[PDB]
């Protein structure tokens, strides 16, 4: 009578190409588990989750996102304030991350978890520990691999709706945006640039090896590696703009369960919609040239416009132009099989607790840009 206990419930893992198509339109739970304040030490998970003014996340938020047409949630996570001297993540924090992931997959949406403000631009008391610098890579490889082994072990038994992302926006020691060494004297330093791409590629290898080495489902889980700075290669204003794309090396052994991620915050202010569509076409063309055309699917894991964080956003100042940009950006991405994840907005702050969209018009616009006939 206990024979169904021997049942092996085999878990299929789709290709990353199909995963990225099936994600539909996504959203970022930003400024939440990624929030951090280097001047503080936490004693509860709530202090971390709420330190940038977002509420403690509840499952109803994701029911609302799903019903509005979203198919995937990126859950950025910052780990360094949750790690001891040896790099061990405390159990309470890992349990909380798992709760939020559960909230997402309960809606049959995809969920991406990453390593977020462990990377990024130094500022005041904040100095990111993961840097696109080969000396930093050599120094921190062991700790970074241990972090990914821990995350991978915690999430090993989840099916293919859960994806892992190696690192967020890793910069050189000069905190260069756009391309490695842009912030150097003369806007280039070949020594720094070469070091930076070696480090990106090393961290990418370390991530894949650490995750796949934990075995089981993690041998086939769909994994995501980001370019230098999550830069997207667009533009012709400097001859190095494509280097984050062309200098990325896909780790050995990867083929059917690997994706590449970039971020995009195009400028629309001061432009006509025709020019904006052309800019988006140029962005997508580069992603096609270096990745999609070679069978490497791409995720635009954060997007909005360049004024997303400005005192006057494009949503306020030029809403219709922004919506025309949304329509075309989502459509051009969809035609290439590239998934997009909008950065914050939509349901923000106390609105998430209701739950309610404080940008209902934009949420609907994004969903209809993908699903509407
Ligand atoms: Na603590």
UniProtKB/TrEMBL annotation:
Recorded superkingdom: Bacteria
The protein's name in its UniProt record: Cellulase
Species assigned in the record: uncultured bacterium
Covered range of the whole protein: 24 to 383 of 575
């Amino acid at each position: 009578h206990h024979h169904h206990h021997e049942n092996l419930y085999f878990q299929s893992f789709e290709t990353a190409t199909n995963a990225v198509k099936n994600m539909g339109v996504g959203w970022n739970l930003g400024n939440t588990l990624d929030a951090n304040d280097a001047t503080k030490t936490w004693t509860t998970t709530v202090q971390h989750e709420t330190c940038w003014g977002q509420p403690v996340t509840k499952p109803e938020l994701f029911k609302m996102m799903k019903e509005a047409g979203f198919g995937a949630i990126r859950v950025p996570v910052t780990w360094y304030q949750e790690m001891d001297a040896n790099g061990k993540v405390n159990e309470a924090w890992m349990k909380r991350v798992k709760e939020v992931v559960d909230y997402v997959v309960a809606q049959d949406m995809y969920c991406i978890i990453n390593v977020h403000h462990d990377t990024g631009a130094d500022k005041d008391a904040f100095k990111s520990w993961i840097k696109a610098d080969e000396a930093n890579y050599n120094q921190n490889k062991a700790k970074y691999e241990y972090l990914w082994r821990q995350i991978a072990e915690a999430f090993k038994d989840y099916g293919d709706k859960v994806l892992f992302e190696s690192y967020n926006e890793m910069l050189d020691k000069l905190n260069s945006w756009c391309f490695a060494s842009f912030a150097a004297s003369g806007q280039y330093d070949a020594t720094v640039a070469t070091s930076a791409y070696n480090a990106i590629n090393g961290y990418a290898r370390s991530f894949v090896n650490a995750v796949r080495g934990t075995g089981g489902n993690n041998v086939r889980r769909n994994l995501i590696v980001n370019t230098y700075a999550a830069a997207n290669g667009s533009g012709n204003w400097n001859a190095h703009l494509k280097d984050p794309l062309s200098k990325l090396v896909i780790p050995q052994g990867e083929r059917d369960h690997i994706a590449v991620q970039v971020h995009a915050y195009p400028t629309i202010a001061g432009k006509t919609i025709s020019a904006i569509r052309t800019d988006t076409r140029d962005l997508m063309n580069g992603l096609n040239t270096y990745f999609v055309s070679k069978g490497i699917p791409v995720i635009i894991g954060e997007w909005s416009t360049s004024n997303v964080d400005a005192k006057e956003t494009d949503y306020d100042a030029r809403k219709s132009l922004m919506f025309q940009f949304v329509d075309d950006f989502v459509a051009q991405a969809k035609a290439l099989g590239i998934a997009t994840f909008y950065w914050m907005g939509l349901s923000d702050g106390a609105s998430r607790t209701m739950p309610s969209f404080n940008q209902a018009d934009l949420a609907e616009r994004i969903a209809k840009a993908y699903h509407g006939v």
